[PDB]
Amino acid sequence: RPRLDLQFLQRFLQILKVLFPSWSSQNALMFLTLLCLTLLEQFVIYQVGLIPSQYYGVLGNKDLEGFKTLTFLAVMLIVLNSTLKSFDQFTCNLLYVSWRKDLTEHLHRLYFRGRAYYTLNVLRDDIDNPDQRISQDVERFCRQLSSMASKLIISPFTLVYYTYQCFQSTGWLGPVSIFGYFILGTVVNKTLMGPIVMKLVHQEKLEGDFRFKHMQIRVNAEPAAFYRAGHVEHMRTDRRLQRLLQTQRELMSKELWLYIGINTFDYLGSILSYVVIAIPIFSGVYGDLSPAELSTLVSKNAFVCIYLISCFTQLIDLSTTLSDVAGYTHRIGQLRETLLDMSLDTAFLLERVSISAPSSDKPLIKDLSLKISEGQSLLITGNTGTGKTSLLRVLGGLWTSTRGSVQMLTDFGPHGVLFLPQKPFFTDGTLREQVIYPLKEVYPDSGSADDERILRFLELAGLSNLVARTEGLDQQVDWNWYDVLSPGEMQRLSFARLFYLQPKYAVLDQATSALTEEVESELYRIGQQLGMTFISVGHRQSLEKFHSLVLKLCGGGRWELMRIK
Amino acid sequence: RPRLDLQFLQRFLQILKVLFPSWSSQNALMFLTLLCLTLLEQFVIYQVGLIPSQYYGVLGNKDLEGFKTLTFLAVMLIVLNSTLKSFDQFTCNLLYVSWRKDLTEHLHRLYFRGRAYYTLNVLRDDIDNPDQRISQDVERFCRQLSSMASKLIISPFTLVYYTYQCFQSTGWLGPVSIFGYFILGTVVNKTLMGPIVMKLVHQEKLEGDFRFKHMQIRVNAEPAAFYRAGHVEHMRTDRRLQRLLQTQRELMSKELWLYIGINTFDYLGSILSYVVIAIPIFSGVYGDLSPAELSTLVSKNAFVCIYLISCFTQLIDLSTTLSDVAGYTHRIGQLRETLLDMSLDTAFLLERVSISAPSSDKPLIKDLSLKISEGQSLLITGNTGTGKTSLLRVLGGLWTSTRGSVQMLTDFGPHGVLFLPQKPFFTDGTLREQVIYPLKEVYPDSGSADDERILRFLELAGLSNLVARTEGLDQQVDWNWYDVLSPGEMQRLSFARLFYLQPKYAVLDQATSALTEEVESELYRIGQQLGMTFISVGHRQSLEKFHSLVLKLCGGGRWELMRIK
Ligand SMILES: Nc1ncnc2c1ncn2[C@@H]1O[C@H](COP(=O)(O)OP(=O)(O)OP(=O)(O)O)[C@@H](O)[C@H]1O
Ligand SMILES: Nc1ncnc2c1ncn2[C@@H]1O[C@H](COP(=O)(O)OP(=O)(O)OP(=O)(O)O)[C@@H](O)[C@H]1O
């Protein structure tokens, strides 16, 4: 599928439509000072190309004061040739920084659009590692594009000037025997960069699946070392490593032919200008002199045609770094393609709803005629895998019902409806950010300076000994918030998140790892004290005093609304 | 700290001691066919450098049959110049593959040594992203080393031959004015590659912390999208992105000077051979002729000294790709340094044990006089964060007691002692591998062909409907085993892992998200039926019928051994 086709150009142009969004952008005005910099350095390189030629004239007669103006002209030209070549290398690397800022942030608006970070990771197998496409492949495309962004910018000009310099030396049978050397030179690459990209996207999945294998160790270091699983996870990660090293070694077995088809074009290009001028030795249609029509004509013709291929083998010298780019735009363009179409009182109403697991066909629950009002706070207890949570997912817009109508009558927000997941979430950030987490900032939201509400609610949830652990509410705790915290207090920090953003309906789920009558009840006592109406999931014989309904689910689609008292 | 010092060489040589382990290795014998390949191509490049010179002689007299042997000699030399240059580029990229196979697998033996994946990730802040050092920085060091492994291998020779060619043309005042141009040329880089590496390791932490930020989204897509946290995690990940893009842009502001100090050395090197021969125009100690001693002497001297700097500016042309290498060996050498010193009946005995959290000072538990025998299976119930699990960590060798003596009298294994973590673990692999997980293979271990034991235990744990979900016990399920599974059946798959590897002592922990009398008791009924003696953690009013002791922990170090009946 990633086969360098005519599809790749739309995957490349729609990438380039956001790298360069419009004229007078932060990249096009960095590109115009890239064109007008290699244009200036092409004048200087030729001008410093004349300095050793006009050096023998002043050394050939030994006048130091007439020499001191030449070196001073040369050294001024050298530090002009440097700071034009160095600023050519810099503003490409400033373009590489300002490309991946404009492409990742374009991908971030697509990745966190509504729920597209959810659906790619748990509901899609076509797009394997979207973390690797956004982080590394944008970094690796924008580097391999910027390395060839200094030679794809002067080659629109230095090919034009040298073809004019060649047309005035050979004629109609001149540069079209070099343009025909490009058409043969790039067809022999476009059929040879084929199995590169097919073995590079496959090299990029396995370099991303291996990196995710290490972050199934870094995120899960605490459970894995309980099993003493060093000698297991070695033979699991090396199995992930060898599959990468048997497709990185496979890429070099394919890129060997790409190195051949470039080095053949380069070195035979040093002699193909000479066989253009086989027309004396095969035809001789302008045969006038043996030492003068033959010598210093072809020495004038090879001095201009090798001068042409010197700016024309550049476009094939980067066929490796365009096979790399075409490998990465078949990763990023595989991602923003699937992200673009993916962008397309009385808590909730459920009308004959038939939720199933996404892989299988049988429904987890069969028919729902469900309605939640203020002060109801129904339990959703049941069996182990009967789809207790799968009701809650379609309330959060996670899944869609196969056959049924689901809607909510209250908006998501602080005082609206707030979910709590089964395994809890904690982002990187301060303790102040871990509790207002769906709101991400509170001082423009609230306006009140004092945040004594959360310092109340932390001790009200009981974990005020954590505040001394995180040294106040300061930035960059440098924690993982998963291994350093505790599932006893992951729930309590999730409850302080719920207590801060007290809704008209909480969609609380699995408040376990807390004492069933001592603090599981006490965390629920703040719910009626704040008027929360928490629709909860829990198979514990303490929740029924807080909950009106029961909603058993024992079976492949069951209803059993009980209203215990 | 990463400042290109004399420490860096020991961090580079101890890396190179394992890239090249000994002579006749899989890399040194790939390096000897790299030396003996650029040596062969240096002869060919000079031999094909004579083909256009001896071309005007046969074109200057128009003999096609005497010409047809030249092009046939040339094209044979071109396809010899290609497949020596291309095999030079290939066997470097085969060296890059076979370097990162030998360096990652050296790092994997250090990473999963005893518990070093645990201690780096949850007990260390000095080594931030060891996933990025092992995966990406070994890949990025071994690529930036292999790109300069084709020019650091011929430069021991082509510098020798050209200095001999220069000593026979200028003398004592010749190449030591070029060797002095290297000593100035590399001191002006060794003081300029300083702030590159200091801003590249900092560029590599933030490129690794950002990639881990995406895998705190990919691993946690299910809880984060319950909060509708797209508009939050955008402004969290972009905050992680902008900190990378304000230090990648900072690197280009520092690498601009490194591009200057190379392009100044290169282009002034085109004229510094000429100012070596200021000794006619300043001294004139061999002044004999004006047109003949002055011309075609320096034209012979610039034809050999620029010929020398052509092989001598290569060693400074790669000062960028050695600033990159020195950035990455201060990442890998920061890692294998901290990994090398890190390598240094009656279940357990606890003698006055005073476990604390690693950051704080106060002990979670104060004094332990504890002993576990067969058929005891004590509960460890208590408060939410009083260090219930912290007793279990030192039993697994995770933590060490601050003051106390801990030991075990039974080895870890199938029939020995087996832990279960609070949050459960599932590696990538088949369902057969998810249940024998601390053993990683069973058919050399067991020998028996039929594995009806696990198909018994899965339905005995109840989750035999999972076997149809994973299509048998086949390889590469392509799942995450965390989002696709369920915390109801994460426990049940952990229990089938415990039932397969039935120990004399299970160190079970938090068998929650299962029905307290229906299947939490039923999973424990297989424990006495298999004779497991499971020391467990759980604050539920059903576990006490299976458990002898209680071991309350209500407070900052408490004992309360009760032995309920
Ligand atoms: N994201 C998913 N992708 C694919 N299959 C899934 C996914 N989530 C769940 N499933 C499948 O469908 C079932 C639904 O389980 P569900 O989410 O209802 O968990 P539960 O154990 O009932 O709830 P809880 O653990 O919160 O008590 C899972 O056991 C699994 O087989
Ligand atoms: N790996 C760690 N690094 C630093 N601090 C830690 C780490 N693990 C725990 N802590 C700190 O020490 C405390 C010890 O908690 P512990 O592991 O005993 O959890 P618990 O809630 O008692 O157990 P459980 O959740 O299994 O019932 C944590 O609350 C936290 O403050």
Curated annotation (Swiss-Prot), chains A, B:
<dbReference type="GO" id="GO:0005524">
    <property type="term" value="F:ATP binding"/>
</dbReference>
<feature type="transmembrane region" description="Helical">
    <location>
        <begin position="178"/>
        <end position="198"/>
    </location>
</feature>
<dbReference type="GO" id="GO:0005789">
    <property type="term" value="C:endoplasmic reticulum membrane"/>
</dbReference>
<dbReference type="GO" id="GO:0015889">
    <property type="term" value="P:cobalamin transport"/>
</dbReference>
<dbReference type="GO" id="GO:0015420">
    <property type="term" value="F:ABC-type vitamin B12 transporter activity"/>
</dbReference>
<feature type="transmembrane region" description="Helical">
    <location>
        <begin position="64"/>
        <end position="84"/>
    </location>
</feature>
<dbReference type="GO" id="GO:0005777">
    <property type="term" value="C:peroxisome"/>
</dbReference>
<keyword id="KW-0812">Transmembrane</keyword>
<keyword id="KW-1133">Transmembrane helix</keyword>
<dbReference type="GO" id="GO:0007031">
    <property type="term" value="P:peroxisome organization"/>
</dbReference>
<dbReference type="GO" id="GO:0016020">
    <property type="term" value="C:membrane"/>
</dbReference>
<dbReference type="GO" id="GO:0009235">
    <property type="term" value="P:cobalamin metabolic process"/>
</dbReference>
<dbReference type="GO" id="GO:1990830">
    <property type="term" value="P:cellular response to leukemia inhibitory factor"/>
</dbReference>
<dbReference type="GO" id="GO:0005778">
    <property type="term" value="C:peroxisomal membrane"/>
</dbReference>
<dbReference type="Pfam" id="PF00005">
    <property type="entry name" value="ABC_tran"/>
</dbReference>
<dbReference type="InterPro" id="IPR017871">
    <property type="entry name" value="ABC_transporter-like_CS"/>
</dbReference>
<dbReference type="GO" id="GO:0016887">
    <property type="term" value="F:ATP hydrolysis activity"/>
</dbReference>
<dbReference type="InterPro" id="IPR036640">
    <property type="entry name" value="ABC1_TM_sf"/>
</dbReference>
<dbReference type="GO" id="GO:0043190">
    <property type="term" value="C:ATP-binding cassette (ABC) transporter complex"/>
</dbReference>
<dbReference type="GO" id="GO:0006635">
    <property type="term" value="P:fatty acid beta-oxidation"/>
</dbReference>
<feature type="transmembrane region" description="Helical">
    <location>
        <begin position="31"/>
        <end position="51"/>
    </location>
</feature>
<dbReference type="GO" id="GO:0015910">
    <property type="term" value="P:long-chain fatty acid import into peroxisome"/>
</dbReference>
<keyword id="KW-0472">Membrane</keyword>
<keyword id="KW-1278">Translocase</keyword>
<keyword id="KW-0547">Nucleotide-binding</keyword>
<comment type="function">
    <text>Lysosomal membrane protein that transports cobalamin (Vitamin B12) from the lysosomal lumen to the cytosol in an ATP-dependent manner. Targeted by LMBRD1 lysosomal chaperone from the endoplasmic reticulum to the lysosomal membrane. Then forms a complex with lysosomal chaperone LMBRD1 and cytosolic MMACHC to transport cobalamin across the lysosomal membrane.</text>
</comment>
<keyword id="KW-0256">Endoplasmic reticulum</keyword>
<dbReference type="GO" id="GO:0055085">
    <property type="term" value="P:transmembrane transport"/>
</dbReference>
<keyword id="KW-0067">ATP-binding</keyword>
<dbReference type="Pfam" id="PF06472">
    <property type="entry name" value="ABC_membrane_2"/>
</dbReference>
<feature type="domain" description="ABC transmembrane type-1">
    <location>
        <begin position="27"/>
        <end position="320"/>
    </location>
</feature>
<comment type="subunit">
    <text>Homodimer or heterodimer. Interacts with LMBRD1; this interaction induces the translocation of ABCD4 from the ER to the lysosome membrane. Interacts with LMBRD1 and MMACHC; this interaction ensures the transport of cobalamin from the lysosome to the cytosol.</text>
</comment>
<dbReference type="GO" id="GO:0042760">
    <property type="term" value="P:very long-chain fatty acid catabolic process"/>
</dbReference>
<feature type="transmembrane region" description="Helical">
    <location>
        <begin position="302"/>
        <end position="322"/>
    </location>
</feature>
<dbReference type="InterPro" id="IPR027417">
    <property type="entry name" value="P-loop_NTPase"/>
</dbReference>
<dbReference type="GO" id="GO:0005324">
    <property type="term" value="F:long-chain fatty acid transmembrane transporter activity"/>
</dbReference>
<keyword id="KW-0225">Disease variant</keyword>
<dbReference type="InterPro" id="IPR003593">
    <property type="entry name" value="AAA+_ATPase"/>
</dbReference>
<feature type="transmembrane region" description="Helical">
    <location>
        <begin position="267"/>
        <end position="287"/>
    </location>
</feature>
<feature type="domain" description="ABC transporter">
    <location>
        <begin position="350"/>
        <end position="564"/>
    </location>
</feature>
<dbReference type="InterPro" id="IPR050835">
    <property type="entry name" value="ABC_transporter_sub-D"/>
</dbReference>
<feature type="binding site">
    <location>
        <begin position="382"/>
        <end position="389"/>
    </location>
    <ligand>
        <name>ATP</name>
    </ligand>
</feature>
